[PDB]
Design a protein around this nucleic acid. Structure first.
Ligand SMILES: Nc1ncnc2c1ncn2[C@@H]1O[C@H](COP(=O)(O)OP(=O)(O)OP(O)(O)=S)[C@@H](O)[C@H]1O
Ligand SMILES: Nc1ncnc2c1ncn2[C@@H]1O[C@H](COP(=O)(O)OP(=O)(O)OP(O)(O)=S)[C@@H](O)[C@H]1O
Ligand SMILES: Nc1ncnc2c1ncn2[C@@H]1O[C@H](COP(=O)(O)OP(=O)(O)OP(O)(O)=S)[C@@H](O)[C@H]1O
Ligand SMILES: [Mg+2]
Ligand SMILES: [Mg+2]
Ligand SMILES: [Mg+2]
Lengths: 318, 327, 330, 257, 332
DNA sequence: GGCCCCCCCGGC
């Protein structure tokens, strides 16, 4: 009862660039670079769980073959990446003499580079510039604005897009066929709808289902995976009448265990990204939501405050 | 940047500009010919517009795109330009100029520059944007005024929103450290007040003057505290009361008799100083506080130099009591 | 602990030790039991409000997985401990990358109350979680999801703990009565559930207070009056009378009735406002602005009360707000 | 008093306390008639320290009933530092004690220092973790082990130990390079203290952290020889024998993947 | 003693001297024989007897000998940051209980746990508060927590859920008259009928203020040296209560409706030093209790008074707020 | 190797 089974996220983690779905142009470009060699400095940006770390790892593995152990230097947020580390260990790795095939180069993979300090990024500039004939740099980040401009200038840009429904669905069919999982169309649609483009969350939900209920359907997925609360908040904020909004808040948000602070924050974000509403009305609703948030942060996290905020928003939009 | 201040007048300053689209056309065409990929000249400028003067970035872009796409024409220039757009945080002056523009707040502009974009623009520099907005929101010609609304009403609404944002900021930097309210401060301090007076600037953009005023007020408060604690043993009042009530009466005894008796009032002034444990530096600080029609700079300057020299000699030729020891 | 478990508070005395003693979370309990019965245990994120039983559930799961000697085979870190970037970098990484000591098994890390952790630590934990997944599993317990980074949320399977249902609270109350040899009137039970708001800690605390209040628990039955006296909460009849007087009677008699009701048992104004809000939420109003005014003015009054001030003025304001809001009905 | 333990020299207890203070924080002592035992688990739950001191290490020892004492090693070390290195140290405890009394007495003078440390409520068991039949055992001088550990920790943070036919290998793989040290058992009849002994049942290959080994070798001042016992699917044992007791470090090997 | 204020001299020493907090005092007394005291959260208005109650409970539980070694008290006058909570409170809670002496075990129950009293808990930051959630639960068997606050909303939800809540009711003339009368007899203070009731009504749930007013009145009577009984007019004067005549003039000026006259009268009135809160309370009483005004007037004036009180509670200028309130009332 | 001290972010 102590022998853990490898999760499908790691068990079915792609090992070749042909198993990565989405961002077709970038994947083919990476495959062509790996085939032809001469990998340039690159920065890959995108939202979590879309296949950036997997892409860079597969590229490095395919490029370096058996020399992966001695030709790859991987550093992430869980390791010390201070200015001294950049100044000593990275420089030593770049200056290292390693015999490689004619079309290959040493690779430094600085994952989650958005958390690095400014000093390390500044010090890395000439390190990449001088030793570009032996070592190449591949950064993986979630926010591209956290990387200093000089580093972006010295590196190519690869902005990963959001995984389409078709790609996630195809990967789901492939993994289900490999695992021989009994499924229904509605269950897969619900899983993809709840994933919101996050492949990792989709895999986790697909495993939890079948791992807990056997067969995949809408009810089985929904009894363990809840619908994203941002959609419920948007529905509440767009209610035609105050009664409907109050009912939605009471039934789907307050009685389901969601905290008031989370509700007000989600309302703030949704109002921030409501295109259908006019900008001035959105600003007034943002002001009211900020007043409610300030009241909640002071200690009064009561449903009365949320109801009053909804009533004021309805009055403003009338 | 302030770190470069020491290098102000010790080196020959050489400034490099962003190369024009015509100074690199030949080099880029030569590179395209050498690498055997077609590069349409008519779309070259946009590439620089995409890279914004970065020859290294455009060279890297060409190298990456030529890996699988051997033709660079108008059919795919838009996609690569959108995908390779460089994002650089705007400076406070640029932030103020862009945020106070009425185009982005229109129905058509809002769909291009959204509320999230404005919040990100504020967050590019969150320590200066509210000050610049508060300073430069009175020098615009609004174009988004509501039918029947006047400029003054919009200014008043913006000022009220700025006050609310100031309250929010004070709550943010309290002992609780409620930084999660920073996005709200973006709307109440910069976005909303600018949305009511957005338009075209009526003049040059001026940097916020609140910092210098705050420093001057802090220095004045320090001098007032020094004077108050120097005269504490004699007076029964606080520094506020000393400034509001005592200082004019003191001027009536420490500056007025120099303008009537000439150099014969030195003894009385010295006696007053001894009675209230005042010094010459305290005299200068006190005479520098007055404002309005009671400015003393011109009056002090017009005093004959002989009188001032005699007063200084008399002050330095005798011992004076000290109120506070080892200040 | 000291002496015996009888000296412990009821909140801690009745802490579940196994998974079958957790009530109101049948779906989650069954899912975790199935996960631990066949070896497929993923990373867990228990999100829920206070008093739902997340800590008890994870403790029971750890005990079932490992056994009696579970404290020495798991790494439990909470807000009471220092959890910084250095701690995550060194201690958590060593625990995840090292084999067991006492007996063979996988490594379990329980980051209780992880919502109070810095963003740097959460960012660092991503690769620690994704690298030692083969031999280590992570469980994170949270009350506010907005404090967790999206990257951390993506790597964990989410389980939501709903407020305790009525039947679960009744079953726990019956068990507590059997253990403590106590009798509870049905109306007292309904009042306890109504005031509980889905928190079992409140149930246990109020029940202990009521037991202490009884002159002799051996042959005394707790009634709604006992619960109201212990908690000081207004009775439903008092709330109904106050609302009736405010709605139909004039100013002077309404003020007199409110003062008399408050002074009879030393009731607090905030509880009266809350009860009036609950009662009026079920009123079939014919207009919307009346409800808008009621909600806004009552929220303003509650916010003012939270900061203190004159109580008589606040009560008069409540009466005036209710009267003005209901005037719009016509 | 109920429990009264008299030490020949305060340094005797001070050296053992200093031998494992830098790897664990909270300690639990069980005092009985046979002697004093203690087990401490570090925060990372990787290293376990087990100390036993017999009655032969005490001048006068009396313990009517078992006593459980929870202490903070930092506080105990501070109090021991407050005491001198030439006075007699006495451990004093009473029934259900809320504190432990350390008595420092000087024979030359009439100065008596009585320090009281408030005890700690640490409810835990010992579990007597010790594998009956280890795969391999070896014994070698402590100085050589400390030198090898310090040399191989300068190259990398991980050290791999391999036990095979008539040979022990320590390997470190790092960024600047790698290092290997191979030692073969031999017996010397003129300096027996410098001999190295090895008895193996199956070949072993186990990886350990460099920091834990560095902290373990700090107990080289309590003994001249160290016994290292390795076994698959079992923590590695590092034993330093004392005058009448012993000290043991149980270190869990790193996961192999 | 004679060198202490009456508020401190007559501070309760045991649990039997608490007057109007029986709903919690009974539970606390029962815990003496039950020995299962839970974590407590004492909340209520100022001057209700929370710190006194907890001190009396600790005394009756441990004794003057074990009080020092079994109680750890932290208030707003000590640093209570997150680091302090994580280190000092954790260390004290995890410590073993001090060994009682046979004397204490003979004459006192000596419960097998210690008490940490976090007075003025409403001033602690949320981050610091969050660090105690597991500290209270893990060491509940050796330590118990008492959190005393005036605003219950300032305590985070998890701590309120963990703690057993105890509300202290306001001390009015209907439940605290006995203690004030006993204090008066002990001090041999002679007062006219209804004087103590007037004092308690003016106090409005604050027995400390009532005791201070009684002490001031007794001092004034002793200095007078006439032997006459203390009247209610002198008590009202000592309490800063505006005379009824001034209130009558104020309401007449408000009824006049002229802005200039109201402003001039307010300017003259503010030179006497009357507190704005007392004026607002008296105006509210007079207007609400009067039967010469219609429903709408009272409906508007209640909200106006509430807004004025809320603004004054934030520490603003009294002159401007009073003038604005009077102007608004005059236009009703 | 360990304190002690100074500068700098802090939303998505
Ligand atoms: N394009 C993809 N195709 C197939 N599986 C994917 C893909 N992207 C993600 N996954 C799956 O999700 C798992 C995690 O993918 P990741 O590489 O960790 O995503 P990520 O974008 O690098 O996450 P961040 O930004 O570091 S938090 C993979 O092992 C895959 O099993
Ligand atoms: N499902 C439950 N069944 C029985 N008792 C419960 C249950 N949930 C909570 N309790 C009781 O309330 C006490 C506290 O439960 P907890 O496990 O601490 O709740 P919690 O969700 O961990 O609180 P938070 O989210 O950390 S503030 C338990 O000892 C139980 O006595
Ligand atoms: N229930 C009471 N019984 C007798 N005297 C009381 C009572 N409450 C307050 N007092 C008296 O008023 C004095 C002060 O009481 P406190 O204990 O300070 O009230 P408090 O609740 O602690 O006020 P806060 O909320 O900390 S400002 C006591 O010394 C008593 O003399
Ligand atoms: Mg990744
Ligand atoms: Mg918990
Ligand atoms: Mg008090």
């Amino acid at each position: 009862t102590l022998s853990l089974q490898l999760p499908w996220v790691e068990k079915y983690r792609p090992q070749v660039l042909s198993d990565i779905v989405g961002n077709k142009e970038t994947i083919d470009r990476l495959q062509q670079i790996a085939k032809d060699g001469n990998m340039p400095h690159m920065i890959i940006s995108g939202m979590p769980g879309i296949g950036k770390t997997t892409s860079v790892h597969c590229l490095a593995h395919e490029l370096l073959g058996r020399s992966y152990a001695d030709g790859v230097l991987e550093l992430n947020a869980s390791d010390d990446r201070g200015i001294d580390v950049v100044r000593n260990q990275i420089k030593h790795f770049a200056q290292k003499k390693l015999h490689l095939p004619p079309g290959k180069h040493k690779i430094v993979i600085l994952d989650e580079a958005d958390s690095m300090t400014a000093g390390a990024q500044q010090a890395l500039r000439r390190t990449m510039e001088l030793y570009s004939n032996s070592t190449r740099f591949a950064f993986a980040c979630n926010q591209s604005n956290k990387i200093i401009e000089p580093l972006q200038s010295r590196c190519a840009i690869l902005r990963y897009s959001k995984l389409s429904d078709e790609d996630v669905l195809k990967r789901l069919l492939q993994i289900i066929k490999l695992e021989d999982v009994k499924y229904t169309n509605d269950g897969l649609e619900a899983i993809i709808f709840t994933a919101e483009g996050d492949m990792r969350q989709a895999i986790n939900n697909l495993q939890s289902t079948v791992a807990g209920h056997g067969l995949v359907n809408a009810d089985n997925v929904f009894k363990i995976v809840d619908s994203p609360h941002p959609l419920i908040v948007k529905k509440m904020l767009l209610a035609s009448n105050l009664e409907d909004s109050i009912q939605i808040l009471r039934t789907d948000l307050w009685k389901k265990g969601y905290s008031s602070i989370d509700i007000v924050t989600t309302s703030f974000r949704v109002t921030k990204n409501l295109a259908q509403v006019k900008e001035s009305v959105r600003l007034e609703m943002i002001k009211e939501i900020g007043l409610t948030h300030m009241r909640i942060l002071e200690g009064v996290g009561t449903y009365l405050q949320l109801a009053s905020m909804l009533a004021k928003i309805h009055k403003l939009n009338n | 940047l302030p770190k470069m201040r020491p290098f102000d007048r010790v080196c020959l300053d050489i400034q490099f500009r962003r190369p024009d689209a015509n100074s690199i056309k030949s080099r880029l065409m030569t590179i395209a010919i050498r690498e055997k990929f077609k590069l349409d000249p008519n779309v070259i400028d946009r590439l620089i517009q995409t890279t914004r003067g970065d020859i290294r970035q455009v060279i890297n872009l060409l190298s990456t795109i030529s890996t699988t796409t051997k033709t660079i024409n108008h059919e795919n220039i838009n996609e690569i330009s959108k995908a390779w757009e460089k994002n650089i945080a705007l400076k406070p002056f640029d932030i103020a100029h862009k945020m106070l523009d009425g185009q982005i707040y229109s129905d058509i502009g809002s769909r291009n520059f959204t509320l999230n974009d404005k919040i990100a623009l504020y967050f590019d520099d969150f320590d200066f944007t509210p000050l610049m907005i508060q300073e430069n929101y009175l020098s615009t010609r609004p174009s988004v005024l509501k039918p029947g609304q006047s400029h003054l009403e919009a200014v008043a609404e913006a000022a009220n929103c700025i006050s609310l944002g100031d309250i929010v900021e004070k709550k943010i930097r309290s002992s609780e450290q409620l930084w999660s309210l920073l996005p709200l401060h973006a709307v109440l301090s910069s976005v909303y007040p600018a949305s009511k007076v957005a338009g075209h600037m009526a003049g040059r953009i001026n940097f916020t003057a609140w910092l210098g005023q705050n420093s001057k007020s802090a220095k004045y408060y320090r001098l007032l505290q020094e004077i108050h604690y120097h005269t504490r043993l004699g007076t029964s009042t606080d520094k506020i009361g000393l400034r509001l009530d005592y200082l004019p009466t003191f001027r009536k005894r420490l500056l007025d008799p120099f303008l009537k008796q000439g150099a014969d009032a030195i003894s009385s002034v010295i006696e007053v100083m001894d009675d209230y444990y005042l010094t010459k530096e305290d005299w200068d600080s006190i005479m520098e506080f007055f404002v309005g029609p009671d400015v003393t700079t011109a009056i002090i300057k017009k005093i004959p130099a002989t009188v001032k020299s005699g007063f200084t000699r008399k002050y330095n030729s005798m011992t004076h009591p000290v109120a506070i020891y080892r200040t | 602990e000291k002496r015996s478990k009888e000296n412990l508070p009821w909140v801690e005395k009745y802490r579940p030790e196994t998974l079958d003693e957790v009530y109101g979370q049948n779906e989650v309990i069954t899912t975790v039991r199935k996960f631990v019965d066949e070896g497929k245990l993923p990373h867990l994120l228990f999100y829920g409000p206070p008093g739902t039983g997340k800590t008890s559930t994870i403790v029971a799961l750890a005990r079932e997985i490992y056994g009696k000697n579970y404290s020495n085979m798991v790494l439990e870190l909470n807000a009471s401990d220092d959890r910084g970037i250095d701690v995550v970098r060194n201690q958590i990484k060593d625990f995840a990358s090292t084999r067991q000591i006492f007996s063979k098994g996988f490594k379990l890390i329980i980051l209780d109350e992880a919502d109070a952790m810095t963003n740097a630590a959460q960012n660092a934990l991503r690769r620690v979680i994704e690298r030692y997944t083969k031999n280590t599993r992570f469980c994170v317990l949270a009350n506010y999801a907005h404090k967790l980074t999206p990257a951390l949320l993506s790597r964990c399977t989410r389980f939501r703990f709903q407020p305790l249902p009525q039947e679960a609270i009744e079953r726990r109350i019956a068990n507590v009565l059997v253990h403590e040899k106590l009798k509870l009137s049905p109306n007292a039970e309904k009042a306890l559930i109504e005031l509980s708001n889905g928190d079992m800690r409140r149930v246990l605390n109020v029940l202990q207070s009521c037991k202490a209040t009884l002159d002799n628990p051996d042959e005394d039955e707790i009634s709604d009056d006992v619960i109201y006296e212990c908690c000081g909460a207004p009775r439903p009849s008092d709330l109904k009378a106050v609302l009736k007087s405010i709605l139909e009677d004039d100013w002077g008699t309404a003020h007199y009735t409110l003062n008399k009701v408050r002074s009879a048992k030393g009731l607090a104004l905030i509880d009266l406002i809350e009860g009036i809000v609950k009662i009026l939420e079920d009123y079939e109003l014919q207009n919307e602005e009346t409800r808008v005014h009621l909600l806004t003015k009552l929220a303003d009054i509650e916010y003012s009360i939270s900061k203190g001030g004159n109580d008589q003025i606040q009560g008069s304001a409540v009466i005036g707000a209710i009267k003005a809001s209901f005037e719009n009905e016509t | 008093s109920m429990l009264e333990a008299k030490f020949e020299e305060a340094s005797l207890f001070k050296r053992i306390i200093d031998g494992f203070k830098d790897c664990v924080q909270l300690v639990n002592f069980q005092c009985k008639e046979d002697g004093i035992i203690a087990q401490a688990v570090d925060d990372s739950r990787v290293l376990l320290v087990s100390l036993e001191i017999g009655v032969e290490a005490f001048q006068e020892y009396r313990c009517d009933h078992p006593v459980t004492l929870g202490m903070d090693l930092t506080s105990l070390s501070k109090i021991l530092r407050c005491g001198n290195n030439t006075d007699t140290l006495t451990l004093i405890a009473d029934n259900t004690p809320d504190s432990i009394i350390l008595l420092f007495e000087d024979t030359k003078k009439d100065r008596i220092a009585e320090y009281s440390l408030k005890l700690m409520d640490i409810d835990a068991d010992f579990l007597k973790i010790e594998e009956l039949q280890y795969d391999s055992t070896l014994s070698l001088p402590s100085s050589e082990f400390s030198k090898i550990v310090r040399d191989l920790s300068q190259l990398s943070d991980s050290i791999n130990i391999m036990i095979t036919k008539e040979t022990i290998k320590f390997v470190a793989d790092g960024d600047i390079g790698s290092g290997s040290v191979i030692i073969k058992p031999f017996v010397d009849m003129e300096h027996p203290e410098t001999s190295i002994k090895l008895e193996m049942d199956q070949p072993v290959d186990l990886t350990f952290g460099a920091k834990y080994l560095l902290d373990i070798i700090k107990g080289s001042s309590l003994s001249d020889r160290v016994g290292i016992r390795l076994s698959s699917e079992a923590p590695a044992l590092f034993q330093f024998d004392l005058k009448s007791g012993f000290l043991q470090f149980f270190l869990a090997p790193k996961f192999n993947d | 003693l004679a060198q202490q204020p009456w508020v401190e001299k007559y501070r309760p020493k045991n649990l039997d001297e608490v007057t109007a907090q029986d709903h919690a005092v009974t539970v606390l007394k029962k815990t003496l024989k039950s020995a299962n005291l839970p974590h407590m959260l004492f909340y209520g208005p100022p001057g209700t007897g929370k710190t006194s109650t907890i001190l009396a409970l600790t005394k009756e539980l441990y004794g003057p000998d074990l009080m020092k070694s079994r109680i750890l008290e932290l208030n707003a006058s000590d640093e209570r940051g997150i680091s302090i909570v994580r280190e000092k409170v954790k260390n004290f809670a995890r410590l073993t209980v001090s060994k009682p002496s046979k004397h204490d075990l003979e004459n006192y129950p000596c419960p097998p746990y210690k008490i940490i009293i976090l007075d003025e808990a409403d001033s602690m930051t949320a981050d610091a508060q969050s660090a105690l959630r597991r500290t209270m639960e893990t060491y509940s068997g050796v330590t118990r927590f008492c959190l005393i606050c005036n605003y219950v909303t300032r305590i985070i939800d998890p701590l309120a859920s963990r703690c057993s809540k105890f509300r202290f009711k306001a001390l009015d003339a209907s439940n605290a008259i006995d203690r004030l009368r006993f204090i008066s007899e002990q001090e041999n203070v002679k007062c006219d009928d209804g004087v103590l009731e007037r004092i308690l009504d003016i106090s409005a749930g604050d027995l400390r203020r009532g005791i201070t007013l009684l002490q001031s009145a007794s001092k004034g009577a002793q200095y007078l040296g006439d032997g006459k009984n203390i009247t209610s007019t002198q008590v009202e004067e000592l309490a800063g209560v505006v005379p009824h005549d001034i209130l009558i003039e104020i309401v007449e000026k408000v009824k006049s409706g002229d802005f200039d006259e109201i402003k001039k009268y307010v300017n003259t009135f503010m030179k006497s030093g009357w507190s704005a809160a007392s004026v607002v309370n008296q105006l509210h009483e007079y207007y609400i209790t009067n039967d010469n005004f219609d429903t709408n007037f009272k409906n508007q004036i209640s909200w106006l008074l509430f807004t004025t009180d809320s603004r004054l509670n934030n520490g603003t200028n009294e002159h401007i707020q009073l003038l604005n309130l009077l102007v608004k009332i005059s236009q009703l």
